[PDB]
Amino acid sequence: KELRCQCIKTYSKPFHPKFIKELRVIESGPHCANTEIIVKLSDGRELCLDPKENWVQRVVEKFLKRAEN
Amino acid sequence: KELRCQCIKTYSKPFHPKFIKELRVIESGPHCANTEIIVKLSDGRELCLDPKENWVQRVVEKFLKRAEN
């Protein structure tokens, strides 16, 4: 339940939110100096995304609007 | 990695986003007919939230804005 940082790199190419099926956002703290965004893709693969990127914020917002329907 | 629905009930009292340290959003699919929002609180407890509630959408948005700083 208590892991260190989970992301070794972040994916830098924008993509459409339809390809996300799960989102995890882990705020920075004693376990990891960076906030981490981990997404599970439609096919089960996992990717980390940079929370400071405008396109990442937009993709997350769009995923949330959809999952909430 | 493949669980059924993870939420037995959702917490119905609004609260301040400062008390969230992790957010998971799991879109509905074959594993669970409902989209689920699971938050880890500052002290490690877990709560599920109803994604259709306006206050929940607002708390999530605020958490994201903060974690992204």
From Swiss-Prot, chains A, B:
Outcome of swapping K65A: Impairs heparin-binding activity and leukocyte transendothelial migration
Disulfide bond sites: C5-C32, C7-C48
UniProt effect for mutating K62A: Decreases heparin-binding activity. Impairs heparin-binding activity and leukocyte transendothelial migration
Name this protein carries in UniProt: IL-8(8-77)
Source organism: Homo sapiens (Human)
Gene behind this protein: CXCL8
Segment of the intact protein contained: 30 to 98 of 99
